[PDB]
Amino acid sequence: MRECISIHVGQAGVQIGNACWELYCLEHGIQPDGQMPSDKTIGGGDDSFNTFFSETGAGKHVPRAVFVDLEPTVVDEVRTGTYRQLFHPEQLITGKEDAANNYARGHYTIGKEIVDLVLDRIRKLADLCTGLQGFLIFHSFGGGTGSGFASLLMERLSVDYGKKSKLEFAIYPAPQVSTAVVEPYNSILTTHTTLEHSDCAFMVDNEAIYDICRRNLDIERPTYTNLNRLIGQIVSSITASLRFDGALNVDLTEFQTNLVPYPRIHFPLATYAPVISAEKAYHEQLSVAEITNACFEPANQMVKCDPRHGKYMACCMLYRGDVVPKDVNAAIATIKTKRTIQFVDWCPTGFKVGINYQPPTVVPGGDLAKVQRAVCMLSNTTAIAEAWARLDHKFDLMYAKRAFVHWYVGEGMEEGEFSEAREDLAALEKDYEEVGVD
Amino acid sequence: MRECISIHVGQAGVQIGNACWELYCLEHGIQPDGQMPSDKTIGGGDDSFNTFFSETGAGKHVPRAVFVDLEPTVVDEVRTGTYRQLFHPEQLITGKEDAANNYARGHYTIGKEIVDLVLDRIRKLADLCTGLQGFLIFHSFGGGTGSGFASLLMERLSVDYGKKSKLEFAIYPAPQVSTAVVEPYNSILTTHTTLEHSDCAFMVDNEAIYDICRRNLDIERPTYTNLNRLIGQIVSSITASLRFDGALNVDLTEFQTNLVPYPRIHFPLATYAPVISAEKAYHEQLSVAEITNACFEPANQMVKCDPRHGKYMACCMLYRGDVVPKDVNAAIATIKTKRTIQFVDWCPTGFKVGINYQPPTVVPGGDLAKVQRAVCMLSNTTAIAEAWARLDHKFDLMYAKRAFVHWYVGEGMEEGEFSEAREDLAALEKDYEEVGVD
Amino acid sequence: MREIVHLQAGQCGNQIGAKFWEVISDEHGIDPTGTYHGDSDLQLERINVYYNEATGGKYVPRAVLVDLEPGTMDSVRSGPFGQIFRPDNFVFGQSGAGNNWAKGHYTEGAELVDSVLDVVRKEAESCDCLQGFQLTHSLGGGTGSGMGTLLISKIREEYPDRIMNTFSVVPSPKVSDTVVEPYNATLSVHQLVENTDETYCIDNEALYDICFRTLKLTTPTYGDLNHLVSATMSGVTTCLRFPGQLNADLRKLAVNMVPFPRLHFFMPGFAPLTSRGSQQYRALTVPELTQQMFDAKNMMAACDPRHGRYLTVAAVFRGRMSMKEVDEQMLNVQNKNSSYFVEWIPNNVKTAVCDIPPRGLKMSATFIGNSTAIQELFKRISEQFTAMFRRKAFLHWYTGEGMDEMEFTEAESNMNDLVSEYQQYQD
Amino acid sequence: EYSIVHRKCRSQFTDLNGSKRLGINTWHDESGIYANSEAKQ
Amino acid sequence: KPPAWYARLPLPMHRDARAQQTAEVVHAHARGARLTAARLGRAQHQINGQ
Amino acid sequence: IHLPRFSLKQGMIPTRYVMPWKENMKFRNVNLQQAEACGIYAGPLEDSLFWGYSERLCHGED
Amino acid sequence: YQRHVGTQLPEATRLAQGTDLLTRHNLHMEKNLKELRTTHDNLAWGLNCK
Numbered sequence A, B: 001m002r003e004c005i006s007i008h009v010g011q012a013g014v015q016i017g018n019a020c021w022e023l024y025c026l027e028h029g030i031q032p033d034g035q036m037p038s039d040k041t042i043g044g045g046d047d048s049f050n051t052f053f054s055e056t057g058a059g060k061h062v063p064r065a066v067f068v069d070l071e072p073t074v075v076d077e078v079r080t081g082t083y084r085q086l087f088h089p090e091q092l093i094t095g096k097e098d099a100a101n102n103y104a105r106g107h108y109t110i111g112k113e114i115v116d117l118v119l120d121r122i123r124k125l126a127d128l129c130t131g132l133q134g135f136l137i138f139h140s141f142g143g144g145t146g147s148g149f150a151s152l153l154m155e156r157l158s159v160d161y162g163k164k165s166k167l168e169f170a171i172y173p174a175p176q177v178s179t180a181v182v183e184p185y186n187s188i189l190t191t192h193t194t195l196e197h198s199d200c201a202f203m204v205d206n207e208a209i210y211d212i213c214r215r216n217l218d219i220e221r222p223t224y225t226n227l228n229r230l231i232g233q234i235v236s237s238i239t240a241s242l243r244f245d246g247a248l249n250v251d252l253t254e255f256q257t258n259l260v261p262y263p264r265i266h267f268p269l270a271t272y273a274p275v276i277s278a279e280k281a282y283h284e285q286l287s288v289a290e291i292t293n294a295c296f297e298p299a300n301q302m303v304k305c306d307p308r309h310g311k312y313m314a315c316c317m318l319y320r321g322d323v324v325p326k327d328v329n330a331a332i333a334t335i336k337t338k339r340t341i342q343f344v345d346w347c348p349t350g351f352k353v354g355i356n357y358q359p360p361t362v363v364p365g366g367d368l369a370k371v372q373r374a375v376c377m378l379s380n381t382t383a384i385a386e387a388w389a390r391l392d393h394k395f396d397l398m399y400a401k402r403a404f405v406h407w408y409v410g411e412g413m414e415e416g417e418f419s420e421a422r423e424d425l426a427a428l429e430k431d432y433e434e435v436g437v438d
Numbered sequence C: 001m002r003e004i005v006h007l008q009a010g011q012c013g014n015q016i017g018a019k020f021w022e023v024i025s026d027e028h029g030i031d032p033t034g035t036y037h038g039d040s041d042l043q044l045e046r047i048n049v050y051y052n053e054a055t056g057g058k059y060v061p062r063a064v065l066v067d068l069e070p071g072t073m074d075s076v077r078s079g080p081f082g083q084i085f086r087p088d089n090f091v092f093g094q095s096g097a098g099n100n101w102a103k104g105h106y107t108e109g110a111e112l113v114d115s116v117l118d119v120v121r122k123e124a125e126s127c128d129c130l131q132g133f134q135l136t137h138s139l140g141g142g143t144g145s146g147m148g149t150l151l152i153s154k155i156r157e158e159y160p161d162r163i164m165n166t167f168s169v170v171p172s173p174k175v176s177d178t179v180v181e182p183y184n185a186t187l188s189v190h191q192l193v194e195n196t197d198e199t200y201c202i203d204n205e206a207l208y209d210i211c212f213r214t215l216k217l218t219t220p221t222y223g224d225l226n227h228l229v230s231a232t233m234s235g236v237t238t239c240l241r242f243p244g245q246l247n248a249d250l251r252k253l254a255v256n257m258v259p260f261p262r263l264h265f266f267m268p269g270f271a272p273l274t275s276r277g278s279q280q281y282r283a284l285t286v287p288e289l290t291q292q293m294f295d296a297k298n299m300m301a302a303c304d305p306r307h308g309r310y311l312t313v314a315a316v317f318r319g320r321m322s323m324k325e326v327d328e329q330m331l332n333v334q335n336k337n338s339s340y341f342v343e344w345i346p347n348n349v350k351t352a353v354c355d356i357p358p359r360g361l362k363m364s365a366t367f368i369g370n371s372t373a374i375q376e377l378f379k380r381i382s383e384q385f386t387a388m389f390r391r392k393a394f395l396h397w398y399t400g401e402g403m404d405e406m407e408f409t410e411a412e413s414n415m416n417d418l419v420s421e422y423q424q425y426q427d
Numbered sequence D: 001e002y003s004i005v006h007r008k009c010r011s012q013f014t015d016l017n018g019s020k021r022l023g024i025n026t027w028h029d030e031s032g033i034y035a036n037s038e039a040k041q
Numbered sequence E: 001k002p003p004a005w006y007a008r009l010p011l012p013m014h015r016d017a018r019a020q021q022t023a024e025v026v027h028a029h030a031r032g033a034r035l036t037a038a039r040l041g042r043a044q045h046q047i048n049g050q
Numbered sequence F: 001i002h003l004p005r006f007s008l009k010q011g012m013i014p015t016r017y018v019m020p021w022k023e024n025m026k027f028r029n030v031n032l033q034q035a036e037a038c039g040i041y042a043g044p045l046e047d048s049l050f051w052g053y054s055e056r057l058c059h060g061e062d
Numbered sequence G: 001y002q003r004h005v006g007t008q009l010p011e012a013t014r015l016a017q018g019t020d021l022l023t024r025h026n027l028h029m030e031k032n033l034k035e036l037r038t039t040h041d042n043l044a045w046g047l048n049c050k
């Protein structure tokens, strides 16, 4: 039927998986025990959970995700958390050796003996699945373990499974903040390895996530929970089409076909418009007009790119809640009449709309507002070339003075592969202006 | 009718039979005293025991097995056990002098004066039997007393009785673990002797037996009782067809005819799929498909052979419990159409299905799963020659430097029979690739 | 007797026919369960032109529903009349379309054409003699375009002597949502014009304007939009089914409607559309009907034929009328705008009057038009096609599917021919 | 709280087996009766 | 740009090439058949005329 | 004696084959006429191009 | 086009041919690979003696 499998790699990428699965159980009302009240929803595992959970007649909702990590510190603590009884023990794939930010260490040294065992989980999850539209890959480019392992995994799952979709979600490297100086190294290494197999890579940056927090959410001191909650809302919104119905129902297959223009470049940008504090929404009102202006407001994006320094290609809006297409197509018509919004002349139309009746909900102990009209804005533009343009001059200096190379070549690489990526990057940027050139 | 006799040789072969008969008394509700309760099941010895026990007018279920050893240590203690009243005192054929791991000493020095005794047991058991399909031979290749004594008697029971089946079961020598360095001597001695006389020889290796325990049963600290339980479960599963019925009933004759392709090679591989810890099946589900995936998962076999390094000829699956043909035929259709499973092209079909309605029951104070759908996977592949390939390079060195020969030439043996077995062995391998070669 | 087999195609169609069928059922008085409540004798006789007989006075709709996405069908099955439809009629596949025409037209259709052919011929053999078939779909619909283009082709050689009635809605000119829609539209129309004999053109934006103009309800439902288009189609179906001196055969209409083979695309027209106070503020007279019937606002199909001229026009009147008023109104409009018709043919008016009024109103009518107002339509798709084919945007899928640019060459070239054809005939 | 007014329910045509329902069922249940039958109301 | 495609033998992407490499010959036959379909169909047409 | 001979093993090959050169009865005799007109192969009555997950040449088991 | 006669695909034959080549070379480098590990270990061992 309509189901998918989620993947969470890297200790940084597992606490995010915790939150969404925490989030996902709330709207489904899943108790911490793992079963429903006496109300009738259990069976052979077929209801709103069947797309996400596997609630066998034993009553235990089994989430369709696998958390893989190599440092048992965090994964054991959540194994002592609240929902650990729901989480399958060896689905919470732990490891005993980190990659030390080294992509290849996570790609060669230990991944060999670990990729075999996860593949058993995959096939034992694949067989019980019926529709299996695709995968939800959660990771990070600057992955101490997220980078190296998933790369071999995404390769191995691609070579046996190359017909279904693979959705990749990773934190983009902070443009001006660096928690690691090898972080650029594996990042370009990850990109060049993934460009020829990754289907759709959607990115996000925490700084502007933080910027939103004290701009409109008005929190000067949030925590990861809020960061995790807001990204968890994003994936929740895109998955509501599976969860509920609407005026029209869309699918990731339509997303891919209508988002990516041409091969290679498959890197659009997401955004959620009604990001606001609770009290503000209390004594103000939400409608399609202002949120449409808001979602296209350049400072509302989590990626440090000026749209007026680039040009638009696709923009996909997913209106969840109570809306009528009357104002929707009217409001976006005014957006088309807007002159600052510079789509490429190649596309007269570039708008993909998804309507869902279900109002987005608050979370207990939450920070969000009481949402009725919501939209997720997935767009792709040419103003992203600066990011890799930032990376290459970051990379080229470091590679010329070849710092930390003794670490990598010490355990068995050479400079050819680092060489290849830079013209792959050079091919990447040179592509950007050529398609940018009309 | 549908009955057989079991034999237990080698000091290892008797504690395993103990647990088997310990298991066997549970499913019949046998009290250790020897009698049923006031319930009406005793008679002329004709009921579920008639195929296994001999509960004559005395009301005592007499097991149809003869236990033979040459050291009184273990046999006296079991003669002081809990069911010793059940066991016939001289069916527990004891001895006073061991074979010292020497095949020949157990084949020449003492076996002459004892076989006449046990042969009397055989005929005095032969007369009381009616259908007597065959025998159950429990032994070991590295037989401290299993090697020599079994070889002589199996010759003697072959020459007088050549019209019935003989079922052989021995622990295969550990490929890299050796509790005896003379163990290779008698092991190849046993194999070459049995090849032209043994009907069906079935093996097992304890290393992967232990490996299973802390893999899925999660028992990092198992025991022989646990090991004896699972092999006792294994022989119980194959004998459930004699005990109960199902959709169809199958017999060792069908097993023999359909499993062995060609003469000599009669060494398939058994496997039991639903081997899981109780708490693991607690919140999960087991069905025909995944256990079929599990039973054909290469690491679930107890013999250190990679099926991808060989090719399949025969496979026998025996579903004990509640099943329906609809999922059985569909799942195997997926299995027959699986790429990795490389059957030999010579066989269009190689599948012998056995269905028994009776669910496998637990044992009090046990450790196993709680199975409704159980299957014993008996199969023969070409990935087995590596073991004998492993054996020969070990033997060719140690024979060329003729270690321990002074022991065997001291007691009256000499090198020729050692010479014979190597090309007899070399015949075995050279047959294995040509059947592999299409 | 001459009957009709219906085809329920495309996901928009999945909303279309469901509304279209319930409009029929509520008109005839059958309960949602299906046991017909005998109330009108004339409808008791002529229902068989669309429905067959099940046991217990239950009239089975002779429609076939096809899709790939179960949820829409589940919603349709959970509709108010899903029980009256047959699970046998619910043929589908186990895949997602991706809103791809080529996958539907070459990949997903291939394993579905066999079953749907069996179902229809089973239904075809169930009935005795058909006028033809009618097909609810859209030109901009991913599955609808892929299915219909295949389905129309196969039935052409199957039954080359029947009516291949079609239903396609033109996507919104201002926004197509689907960006590859112009590809799908251009591909479908090529086979369409070759295979089709009749085509109604419908656009959502005009209906939105109609909502702004007469509905005045601000926030309607697309089902209310379905309600309108179903009412338009229900009216034109009343001709065959109801008595009264009006000649009903679509072939009778088509020969009165089609001067040359390349004329398949036609526009609907409807009768009294009323606002809040005007239901109790309207003097229901054939003059004001005729005025409203010929109103530039009253159209809903594509755009104003004010830009072009009028080739063939035909309006069917439903209710208690007489030949004289429609005659004088025809003269009045003939004297009103004589030059706006083509000098090629005078007296382009075709009139049919159904004496049986609908249930809810007495004076009613429908109009079918063939004017020179389609140029704006296919010229619009032209720059879209040329701009996107200028640099082959979003094309690797179709090559990945197995489509080549050569197929596009004649597809637009055939489209360019009809641009001149409509131009040359009128200009 | 816990509104099922809008939520979707089982699919009759997607999966055709007894592993959705409870109780004794001989046939598949083809019917317009749904848990969400009150959406029209 | 140096010339690189000569023969070697490793083909990282070859299935896809074969699929399209077969896509021409399959389309080649159709064009020829429609030519014969053209002459035969109209042949019957005016035949029925007289 | 002529003997069947076929190719090696694959992983994508279908088990069965249809070969409607002799599996169409609408146009049978016609395609039968062009069987010898081209002279491709008639030979044994019973030739399938896919026995099971295995392929061969045009000459049927000869 | 399995209806028109003559539409056999040598595509599989070429695809099968490519697989055969890759298998052969696999054997080559594997034999080469096994040798070099043995050599290095002796070279490292000789260093220990030195």
Ligand SMILES: Nc1nc2c(ncn2[C@@H]2O[C@H](COP(=O)(O)OP(=O)(O)OP(=O)(O)O)[C@@H](O)[C@H]2O)c(=O)[nH]1
Binding pocket: A009, A010, A011, A012, A013, A014, A015, A016, A071, A098, A099, A100, A101, A139, A140, A142, A143, A144, A145, A146, A147, A171, A179, A180, A224
């Ligand atoms: N995805 C994700 N990233 C985070 C989170 N919190 C901080 N980060 C950033 O993401 C990066 C995590 O990358 P790594 O440190 O390589 O994580 P890893 O590959 O799993 O291995 P470790 O080095 O042991 O953590 C950090 O450098 C942070 O800057 C989080 O919750 N999720």
Ligand SMILES: Nc1nc2c(ncn2[C@@H]2O[C@H](COP(=O)(O)OP(=O)(O)OP(=O)(O)O)[C@@H](O)[C@H]2O)c(=O)[nH]1
Binding pocket: B009, B010, B011, B012, B013, B015, B016, B071, B098, B099, B100, B101, B140, B142, B143, B144, B145, B146, B147, B171, B179, B180, B224
């Ligand atoms: N199947 C089985 N094998 C065992 C068991 N215990 C030990 N073994 C192994 O099986 C072999 C049994 O052969 P022997 O040691 O010669 O036993 P035996 O011939 O009965 O008499 P002994 O020489 O006194 O030991 C041993 O070498 C052990 O490695 C057991 O309980 N069951």
Ligand SMILES: Nc1nc2c(ncn2[C@@H]2O[C@H](COP(=O)(O)OP(=O)(O)OP(=O)(O)O)[C@@H](O)[C@H]2O)c(=O)[nH]1
Binding pocket: A247, C009, C010, C011, C012, C013, C014, C015, C097, C098, C099, C100, C137, C138, C140, C141, C142, C143, C144, C145, C146, C171, C177, C178, C222
């Ligand atoms: N059901 C429905 N369809 C709509 C609506 N508004 C516009 N449509 C359009 O009607 C078109 C025709 O539907 P289908 O022919 O079934 O389309 P499809 O082949 O299933 O694939 P898609 O076009 O991607 O939906 C769609 O492409 C929609 O763009 C609406 O409100 N309801």
